[PDB]
């Protein structure tokens, strides 16, 4: 699960390589 | 005289045609990211 | 050094001869249990015996064959009626005893001769069937 | 050269030995080194200096010794002890093998030649009272506890004795060659013992087991 | 009544196979299902349990 | 729900002060167990020990006689009933 916290979700997407800068 | 109170394929079909956490994260994520 | 050195029951159990599963000498009773006066209602033996429809032991081939083999002395049982444990053991090992009986029959045929052996199924034959009588004839 | 007798059991030495003068004995978990005095038969062993290393590695260490070791050179015959690992590896590439068989050696027995006689000697017999066991799991070397049952005691005809090794290379017994057991008998004894215990365990759960007979 | 007879029924199913494996390994019903040919433990339980 | 069954014929031996009395869903008196209770069955050959895990119902009493394969412990909508 991606955490409900938006910035934790952003960090998860960065770690899971879903999206990055 | 007296009354007591005591304690598959359809499931996959409704998923294809559309979890409680999924519908609650989508609600939560929508109002924040924008 | 000290590395080189120069030099009933408990035997029937070793050899596999008929013996009790539990040694009678190394056997103890189960003391005294609750007397239905220090027991809960659900664990008390009923005052009168209850009809069951399962009160008789089911007949089968194993019981008959085990009783016959106990009569012949091929095996010996704990009591007169074989138990369910003994019935299961016989069901496991039943081919060996049949092979022993077949071998005994083959040996009897080899010893007595065809005339003596097969006269069991020819009752109208009244002549002597021993090998000596056959040679005399 | 060096004398490892009486040293530490699992310490790593600070030099790389020369393997041209050593007996390299390779086991599953380690490679065992015993100094080899020169000899045309290469059957002569010097147990004063020994080393144990992880398999295919030059980081030498003195092995643990669990028994007194020989001091004079003794001629010995080497025989390994272990199992076969026949596996079915996953087929990844074309023509990948359907099976793979390897020899997992876990023990090595060193049996002294009687009076250090050579193999070519017409009077060559093995001395089964002098056996040294090398263990891969413990990276150690021991002497075998040999039990002799053939009559004769210390002095006897060595040609008529037979060695029996059981219990994962721990039981050593000397018997007369006449009373050797058939392989069928050994296999059937093991099967009978195991199946007898299994059957008694299976029947124990019945409530008339205490008033039942084996037959 | 429901649970005592469900526990009894389920215990017979568990002991059905070790009884076949230890005392009658070549029993036809056992071989027809243990080999994976035709029939499972549930259907044999309907026949022998 | 898993049922602990007696593996031997014998006499049940345990201390009833380490367990809490309760009432089963079947209406029977029983002992609730929240600890690593040790139960002893004094069988005909030797004494045997059965371990009862916590959060389980102990259905037997101390000094009670049990048979083999007999349940001795238990491990663990809206309907309308008319009388």
UniProtKB/TrEMBL annotation, chain E:
Signal peptide: none annotated. It is found in: Plastid, Chloroplast. Residues 1-49 form the RNA polymerase Rpb1 domain. DNA-dependent RNA polymerase catalyzes the transcription of DNA into RNA using the four ribonucleoside triphosphates as substrates. Belongs to the RNA polymerase beta' chain family. RpoC2 subfamily. In plastids the minimal PEP RNA polymerase catalytic core is composed of four subunits: alpha, beta, beta', and beta''. When a (nuclear-encoded) sigma factor is associated with the core the holoenzyme is formed, which can initiate transcription. This is DNA-directed RNA polymerase subunit beta''. The gene is rpoC2.
UniProtKB/TrEMBL annotation, chain F:
It is found in: Plastid, Chloroplast. In plastids the minimal PEP RNA polymerase catalytic core is composed of four subunits: alpha, beta, beta', and beta''. When a (nuclear-encoded) sigma factor is associated with the core the holoenzyme is formed, which can initiate transcription. DNA-dependent RNA polymerase catalyzes the transcription of DNA into RNA using the four ribonucleoside triphosphates as substrates. Belongs to the RNA polymerase beta' chain family. RpoC2 subfamily. This is DNA-directed RNA polymerase subunit beta''. The gene is rpoC2. The chain holds residues 351 to 442 of 1373 of the full protein.
């Amino acid at each position: 699960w991606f955490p409900e916290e938006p910035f934790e979700a952003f960090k998860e997407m960065r770690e899971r390589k879903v999206f990055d800068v | 005289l007296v009354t007591f109170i005591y304690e598959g394929l359809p499931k996959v079909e409704q998923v294809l045609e559309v979890s409680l956490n999924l519908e609650k994260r989508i609600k939560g994520w929508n109002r924040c990211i924008t | 050094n000290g590395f080189v050195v120069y030099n009933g029951f408990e035997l029937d159990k070793k050899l596999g001869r008929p013996h009790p599963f539990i040694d009678p000498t190394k056997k103890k009773q189960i003391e005294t249990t609750l007397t239905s006066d220090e027991s809960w209602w659900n664990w008390r033996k009923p005052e009168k015996e209850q009809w069951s429809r399962w009160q008789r032991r089911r007949p089968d081939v194993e019981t008959v064959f085990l009783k016959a083999m106990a009569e012949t002395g091929q095996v010996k049982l704990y009591g007169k009626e074989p138990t369910l444990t003994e019935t299961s053991l016989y069901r496991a090992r039943r081919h060996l005893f049949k092979e022993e009986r077949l071998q005994a029959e083959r040996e009897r045929l080899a010893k007595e001769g065809p005339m003596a052996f097969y006269s069991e199924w020819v009752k109208a034959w009244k002549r002597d069937t021993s090998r000596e009588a056959v040679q005399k004839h | 050269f060096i004398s490892t007798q009486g040293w530490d059991s699992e310490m790593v030495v600070d030099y790389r030995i020369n393997e041209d003068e050593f007996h390299k004995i390779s086991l599953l978990d380690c490679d065992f080194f015993i100094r080899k005095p020169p000899d045309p038969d290469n059957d002569v062993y010097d147990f004063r200096e020994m080393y144990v290393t992880p398999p295919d590695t030059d980081i030498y260490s003195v092995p643990r010794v669990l028994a007194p070791m020989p001091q004079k050179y003794i001629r010995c015959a080497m025989s390994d002890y272990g199992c076969y690992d026949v596996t079915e590896p996953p087929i990844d590439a074309p023509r990948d093998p359907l099976y793979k068989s390897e020899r997992e050696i876990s023990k090595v027995f060193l049996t002294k030649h009687y009076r250090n006689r050579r193999l070519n000697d017409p009077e060559f017999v093995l001395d089964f009272e002098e056996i040294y066991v090398i263990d891969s799991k413990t990276k150690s070397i021991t002497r075998a506890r040999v039990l002799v049952t053939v009559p004769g005691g210390r002095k006897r005809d060595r040609k008529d004795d037979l060695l029996v090794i059981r219990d994962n290379g721990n039981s050593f017994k000397i018997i007369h060659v006449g009373e050797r057991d058939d392989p069928t008998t050994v296999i059937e004894r093991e099967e009978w013992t195991k199946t007898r215990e299994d059957m008694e365990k299976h029947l124990r759960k019945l409530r008339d087991f205490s008033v039942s007979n084996w037959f | 009544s429901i649970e005592i007879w469900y526990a009894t029924s389920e215990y017979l199913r568990q002991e059905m196979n070790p009884n076949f494996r230890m005392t009658d390994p070549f029993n036809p019903v056992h071989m027809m299902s243990f080999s994976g040919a035709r029939g499972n433990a549930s259907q044999v339980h309907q026949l022998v349990g | 729900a898993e049922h602990v069954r007696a593996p031997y014929n014998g006499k049940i031996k345990f201390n009833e002060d380490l367990v809490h009395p309760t009432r089963t869903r079947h209406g029977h008196p029983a002992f609730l167990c929240y600890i690593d209770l040790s139960v002893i069955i004094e069988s005909e050959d030797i004494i045997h020990s059965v371990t009862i895990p916590p959060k389980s119902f102990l259905l037997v009493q101390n000094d009670q006689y049990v048979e083999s394969e007999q349940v001795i412990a238990e491990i663990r909508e809206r309907v309308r009933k008319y009388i």
